[PDB]
Design a protein around this ligand. Structure first.
Ligand SMILES: [Cl-]
Lengths: 106, 106, 105, 107, 105
């Protein structure tokens, strides 16, 4: 369970797509924090994730609701998600930063 | 321990029923975040879970108390519940979003 | 490790005692969240737990300080305590809800 | 796998806390869960610090939490495990500040 | 999994560099809390970490955004990073304190 640092930045329509690699290994994203960037406005920001569900259909789940003067950072504690996954801002202009661990298994 | 994205949205007249069907494997719901939706009033929101306790009886349980201008998101850190589970808003109009993992055994 | 839902509501004159039976397994309370109920006043609420320490004596312990307009909910991340455990409000009138898991060997 | 006992203490401006090992064989761990301000604490900045050995072998002071009654009365650390010997103290603020956690033992 | 206490302080002109000197065992930095020091102004503080991604390249990630009058402490719950790691203030002058665990197999 070797682990690499992971991160991305979201904007109004700057998605992040985490893909499956053409390796033989398993991969997981263990999401840790969502936090507002210095230039973010004091509006509501909602970060959303999209991935396969249990019965096979795409699901969109909101990870966090952030606002600069109320809650600039949310800690998710190692939210593990199997790729492919898309991360995006459902509202707010961002930037919103996401940090976490990229877990593989050779 | 296979792992899928889970999410739902609750409103005052909209609960969520997590079931698990005529499967053979064991299933667990691992709840990660509870967060207020973009249009939610600045009223008190209380999210409830109902499931079996160890004595065999159904128990109603408060997961989180949320308020948009005080605490829009609560992180539960992987709160596991054995299905069947009903999730509902005990008060507040929502929308309230819940995200987590659906974990499956064999 | 079997896990069942656990929850309770605490008020000024209402301790909560956890419990077990003529049982054969190991039991743990895994406390998850502490949250103020809808009718709680905007007073400071302090939730306390009491259980035996490593020496063997009962020790009272503050789990959380809550205030409705400041921090209505606290997440403990799976705080595990061996029964018997008493939960109570050391101050505030409540209602205060506690949620967690009952774990069985 | 290890056995777990409830742990707690109260810190004030002139009352620190030191984690007591004894003439025993067991490996002990202190797992800290919450830091929360007591009812009578004033509304100043409170900073809780922990003191224990680092890897290279010499003592390090470390900040666990910054708390303020009207902003953030409780901080949950999620099971911060520290090997004894460890000392907990207020680096500033008058308290009382309560600490809760687990005392874990295994051999 | 031997476990030692870890800490550092960050300022506008003072970063922290975590190297384990090449022994033969493996080391991990497990971050726990990011908190503002007593002397910090009430400006936005953003703490970032730099290490390798899975493709071998260095990446910088924001760990936490703090502000004294809003949220002086963020708890990361054991965010493990493989050394070498750089911690720095991307904005704000600090001091910002970091605590966690240094783990050796
Ligand atoms: Cl706040």
């Amino acid at each position: 369970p070797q682990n690499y640092l992971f991160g991305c930045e979201l904007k109004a329509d700057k998605d992040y797509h985490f893909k499956v690699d053409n390796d033989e290994n398993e991969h997981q994203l263990s999401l840790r924090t969502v936090s507002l960037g210095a230039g973010a406005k004091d509006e509501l920001h909602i970060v959303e994730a999209e991935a396969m569900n249990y019965e096979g259909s795409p699901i969109k789940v909101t990870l966090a609701t952030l606002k600069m003067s109320v809650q600039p950072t949310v800690s998710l504690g190692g939210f593990e998600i199997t790729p492919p996954v898309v991360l995006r801002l459902k509202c707010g202009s961002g930037p919103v930063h996401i940090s976490g661990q990229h877990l593989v298994a050779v």
